[PDB]
Amino acid sequence: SEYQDGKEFGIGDLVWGKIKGFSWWPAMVVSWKATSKRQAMSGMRWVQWFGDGKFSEVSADKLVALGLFSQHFNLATFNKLVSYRKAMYHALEKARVRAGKTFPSSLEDQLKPMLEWAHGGFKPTGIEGLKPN
Amino acid sequence: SEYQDGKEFGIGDLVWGKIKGFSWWPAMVVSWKATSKRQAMSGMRWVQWFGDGKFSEVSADKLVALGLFSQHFNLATFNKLVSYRKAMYHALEKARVRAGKTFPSSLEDQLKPMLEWAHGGFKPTGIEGLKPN
Ligand SMILES: CC(C)CCC[C@H](C)NC(C)C
Ligand SMILES: CC(C)CCC[C@H](C)NC(C)C
């Protein structure tokens, strides 16, 4: 099947992806069939970016697990860009549901406990709870 | 292991491949396990074409290193087919990263300095920077 190149990351994985000129941005690894383009080159993954829904073919070496959060979250970009805050909401919402996490009940106000959870290490599940399926 | 048949080219090598009826087209040697098809016959190599991401089993004797660039690049095809130009973009991008090369910030316009880097022997690394890993 897809992505059998001995590199990390499979379909459904929540990741940070790094494109030249941009901060690390959250994304989900997808099958090339979802992209309406072409099969990824060996060593690459198609990802779909949270916040804008676009697809990019990105080297596996330029991806890391979303669970390595406090290590790749860019606070300057977050303060500066509303699109980045939006991306984080959609990414962490996906993470939350997967981990079976719940928060008590505005964007910045919805984000706040989600960021704390993420930044704190995604407790109680830890990064294991972010896996697909 | 795979592709130990005494012939040239191993996994990850960037190459030109020639299929009957076509100009030389850029590709990367992959393991058969990436293809989701059969293992390659003796003397053959699975390649994945840049641009469309498809797989072909090609004789190892009908492949040449991407590094022999201007000899095999086909200017006429390039000007004629947008697919070829796209193929060149992806191939050179992969070459660029492996090399550690970088280009200051459209397709052709991004292609322009990449083609010139290639036609002029991939300086400063030369073709040694094109190797996998
Ligand atoms: C325009 C805004 C939504 C920010 C751009 C996000 C881009 C698509 N992700 C980059 C990592 C390539
Ligand atoms: C996209 C198309 C115009 C051609 C792309 C390369 C294919 C696979 N032909 C090669 C065998 C030379």
Swiss-Prot record, chains A, B:
Parent-protein start and end of this portion: 215 to 351 of 853
Post-translational modification: Sumoylated. Citrullinated by PADI4.
Domain of life of the native organism: Eukaryota
Physiological role: Required for genome-wide de novo methylation and is essential for the establishment of DNA methylation patterns during development. DNA methylation is coordinated with methylation of histones. May preferentially methylates nucleosomal DNA within the nucleosome core region. May function as transcriptional co-repressor by associating with CBX4 and independently of DNA methylation. Seems to be involved in gene silencing.
Name of the protein this chain belongs to: DNA (cytosine-5)-methyltransferase 3B
Pathology noted in the entry: Immunodeficiency-centromeric instability-facial anomalies syndrome 1: A rare disorder characterized by a variable immunodeficiency resulting in recurrent infections, facial anomalies, and branching of chromosomes 1, 9, and 16. Other variable symptoms include growth retardation, failure to thrive, and psychomotor retardation. Laboratory studies show limited hypomethylation of DNA in a small fraction of the genome in some, but not all, patients.
Family indicated by similarity: Belongs to the class I-like SAM-binding methyltransferase superfamily. C5-methyltransferase family.
Assembly information from the UniProt record: Interacts with BAZ2A/TIP5, SUV39H1 and CBX4. Interacts with UHRF1. Interacts with DNMT1 and DNMT3A, SETDB1, UBL1, UBE2I9 and ZHX1. Interacts with the PRC2/EED-EZH2 complex.
Domain notes: The PWWP domain is essential for targeting to pericentric heterochromatin.
Organism, scientific name: Homo sapiens (Human)
Domain named PWWP: residues: 11-69
Tissue-specificity statement: Ubiquitous; highly expressed in fetal liver, heart, kidney, placenta, and at lower levels in spleen, colon, brain, liver, small intestine, lung, peripheral blood mononuclear cells, and skeletal muscle. Isoform 1 is expressed in all tissues except brain, skeletal muscle and PBMC, 3 is ubiquitous, 4 is expressed in all tissues except brain, skeletal muscle, lung and prostate and 5 is detectable only in testis and at very low level in brain and prostate.
Subcellular location: Nucleus
Signal peptide stretch: none
